[PDB]
Ligand binder design. Structure first.
Ligand SMILES: *CCC(=O)N1C[C@H](C)N(c2nc(OC[C@@]34CCCN3C[C@H](F)C4)nc3c(F)c(-c4ccc(F)c5sc(N)c(C#N)c45)c(C(F)(F)F)cc23)C[C@H]1C
Ligand SMILES: Nc1nc2c(ncn2[C@@H]2O[C@H](COP(=O)(O)OP(=O)(O)NP(=O)(O)O)[C@@H](O)[C@H]2O)c(=O)[nH]1
Ligand SMILES: [Mg+2]
Length: 169
């Protein structure tokens, strides 16, 4: 029946992986409180007229390169690669996350979206243009989000579903 899309949210500590997921799942953002675990969350959404189910893994915990961890990530059909626009190191780590995705999926062509989060903040250190140019050289979409104001959140996840759909055809 209803198509399920397995999405994986990856990126450095503190960029807003959990805050983005919770906005989508529970429509809220509390400045003071944040998830502390890795977990996956299911939500039925309508995207371009298609009722579907998103199964979203919000990654956390420890970096680890075991066969078990690799195989878990390999079930992801699409990946949000998140950095924070006020955190240059988190932007510099994006190439590494992409490379691990391509390694476990064993493919040059994995549905992926680059997400620049915390667009509400004024202390910007990553120009929008530099992130656009990076996404263009990878050949993937780039979306600026604010998990605090919810700006661009649906766009990020829905765009990733659209990349998965193109891949399955
Ligand atoms: C904030 C929570 C936290 O402490 N985490 C640990 C680290 C930050 N996580 C994480 N880190 C990296 O790289 C970190 C770093 C710095 C030390 C050396 N190392 C390499 C670069 F220098 C950057 N990489 C992560 C991942 F690659 C992945 C991951 C993503 C996709 C994928 F297919 C696979 S397969 C596989 N095994 C791993 C791993 N590990 C990945 C992940 C993720 F959680 F699995 F997605 C985390 C990485 C983030 C969090 C957990
Ligand atoms: N202003 C602002 N703050 C944000 C935004 N998204 C997340 N934050 C803040 O940034 C911090 C980290 O958020 P969180 O969602 O825990 O990030 P994470 O990537 O899941 N961290 P971890 O990797 O440790 O699980 C929190 O204080 C959160 O309130 C955003 O769009 N705007
Ligand atoms: Mg988190």
């Amino acid at each position: 029946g209803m198509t399920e899309y397995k999405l994986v949210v990856v990126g450095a500590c503190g960029v807003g992986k959990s805050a983005l997921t919770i906005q989508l799942i529970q429509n809220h953002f509390v400045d003071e409180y944040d998830p502390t675990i890795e977990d996956s969350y299911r939500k039925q959404v309508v995207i371009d007229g298609e009722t579907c189910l998103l199964d979203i893994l919000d990654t956390a915990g420890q970096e680890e390169y075991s066969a078990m961890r690799d195989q878990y990530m390999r079930t992801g059909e699409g990946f949000l690669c998140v950095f924070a626009i006020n955190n240059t190191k988190s932007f510099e780590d994006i190439h590494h996350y992409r490379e691990q995705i391509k390694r476990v999926k064993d493919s040059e062509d994995v549905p992926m979206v680059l997400v620049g989060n915390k667009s509400d903040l004024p202390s910007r250190t990553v120009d929008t243009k530099q992130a656009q140019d990076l996404a263009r050289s990878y050949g993937i979409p780039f979306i600026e989000t604010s998990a605090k104001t919810r700006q661009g959140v649906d766009d990020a996840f829905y765009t990733l579903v659209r990349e998965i759909r193109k891949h399955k055809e």
